[PDB]
Amino acid sequence: DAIEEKFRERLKELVVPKHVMDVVDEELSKLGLLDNHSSEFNVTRNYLD
Amino acid sequence: DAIEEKFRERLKELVVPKHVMDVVDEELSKLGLLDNHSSEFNVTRNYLD
């Protein structure tokens, strides 16, 4: 939530396209499914940022 | 199955050839064996999309 929500309020200011909206949100969903420890999750985390 | 289910209603409208039908079916099952988080699952996910 921490990183996700600072980026979410980020997202709340800039008007993202609905395409990019669902992409960032589903990538956030994959963040939630991906475990925090995985290097795969570090890649998607760096990607989210 | 969530992703495969939106895919399968998709396919329920447009009429696929039985060739590509069976191909997507075996790929769908092959996806279903695949882990929910594996990198190759993401590849076959994007591919099935």
- DSSP class per residue in chain B: -HHHHHHHHHHHHS---HHHHHHHHHHHHHHHHS-SS-HHHHHHHHHH-
B37 reaches A (C-beta below 8 A): yes
∠ CA B6-A9-A34, rounded to 5°: 45
Rounded to 5 degrees, what are φ and ψ at B13?
A: -80, -65
Burial of A45 (0-12, 13-18, 19+ CB in 10 A): middle
- Residues B24, B16 contacting (CB under 8 angstroms): yes
Experimental technique, in short, is cryo-EM
For A34, residues 6+ apart whose C-beta sits below 8 A from its C-beta are A40, A41, A44, B37
Tell me whether residues A38 and B37 touch, CB distance under 8 A.
Answer: yes
Resolution of this entry in Å?
3.8
A31 reaches B (C-beta below 8 A): no
